[PDB]
Amino acid sequence: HWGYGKHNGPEHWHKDFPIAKGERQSPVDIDTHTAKYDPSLKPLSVSYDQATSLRILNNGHSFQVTFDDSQDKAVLKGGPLDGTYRLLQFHFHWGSLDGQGSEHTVDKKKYAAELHLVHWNTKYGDVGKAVQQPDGLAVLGIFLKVGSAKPGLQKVVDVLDSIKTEGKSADFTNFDPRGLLPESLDYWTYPGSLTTPPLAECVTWIVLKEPISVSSEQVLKFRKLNFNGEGEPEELMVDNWRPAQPLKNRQIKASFK
Ligand SMILES: [Zn+2]
């Protein structure tokens, strides 16, 4: 069973998931000087006004907030995407200390955390089918730096004590993910993969340039979560990030000059 430790972490994943060594793996370092501005890229359309959050869950690798994706309520369109992508869930990756935690890096800089909003292409009908397609998923990635608090994150922070260990969930209705977005929707994009098993090469990555700021107290609460189930030896859920993978034959494109 895979994880982030010495004996089951990212450098082991290829044994159960050989696509780990594939041609379009994520995350990557974003070399800002090499990314080409693409004037044909559209602004991203984030339509989250009718989002319906359902539950918050500790899945043993991260925590996730899940949405009703049975209709087009919270959708991502435009940008590099063709078609409509439904929001299924968001989750985070973070570090043991503020100098690591993000999956993507920017000129090798690591952020304290990274938010992933996972969306699937409605033309494939369900997420299981979408992960089998090269354009099945769109993941919007947002960097977190530590400074001022993010008010729209606090409702999430405050319930994490109720989902400390793997398998715990709670109701998490009426959460508005618009409160997690930075001012600018300027972005980089590239074709990649899921960053956790099964590492499927089904993702159009959209990584926002502008980080959000969160407070030290907010990120400290992430670090109190446990990878373990209740009753097992306590192992803090920290450093749940995959390192940058080889870019290979890919171009990262920027929406902005
Ligand atoms: Zn992720």
Curated annotation (Swiss-Prot):
The record's annotation in CDD domains points to: alpha_CA_I_II_III_XIII
Annotated Zn(2+) binding lies at: 91, 93, 116
Key word Nucleotide-binding present:
no
How does its activity get regulated? Answer: Activated by X-ray, histamine, L-adrenaline, L- and D-phenylalanine, L- and D-histidine, L-His-OMe and beta-Ala-His (carnosine).
In short, the EC number is 4.2.1.1, 4.2.1.69
Q: Does the keyword Cell membrane apply?
A: yes
Identify the cofactor(s): Zn(2+); Co(2+)
- Consequence recorded when altering residue 116 to D/N/Q: Reduced activity
Q: Where is the Alpha-carbonic anhydrase domain?
A: 1-256
Quote the subcellular location field of this record: Cytoplasm; Cell membrane
Give UniProt keywords alphabetically. Answer: Acetylation, Cell membrane, Cytoplasm, Disease variant, Lyase, Membrane, Metal-binding, Osteopetrosis, Phosphoprotein, Zinc
Effect in UniProt of substituting residue 61 to A: Reduced CO(2) hydrase activity, rescued by 4-methylimidazole (4-MI). Reduced proton transfer. Enhanced proton transfer. Enhanced proton transfer capacity
Cofactor stoichiometry and binding remark: Zinc. Can also use cobalt(II) with lower efficiency, but not copper(II), nickel(II) and manganese(II).
Q: Which GO terms describe its biological process?
A: angiotensin-activated signaling pathway; carbon dioxide transport; morphogenesis of an epithelium; neuron cellular homeostasis; positive regulation of cellular pH reduction; positive regulation of dipeptide transmembrane transport; positive regulation of synaptic transmission, GABAergic; regulation of chloride transport
Q: Impact of changing residue 59 to H on the protein?
A: Reduced proton transfer
- Broadest EC class assigned to this enzyme: lyase
Residues bound to substrate are: 195-196
Q: Result of mutating residue 89 to P?
A: In OPTB3; in Czechoslovakia
The UniProt similarity line reads: Belongs to the alpha-carbonic anhydrase family.
Q: Quaternary arrangement and interactors, per the entry?
A: Interacts with SLC4A4. Interaction with SLC4A7 regulates SLC4A7 transporter activity. Interacts with SLC26A6 isoform 4 (via C-terminus cytoplasmic domain).
Tell me what this protein is called.
Carbonic anhydrase 2
Organism name: Homo sapiens
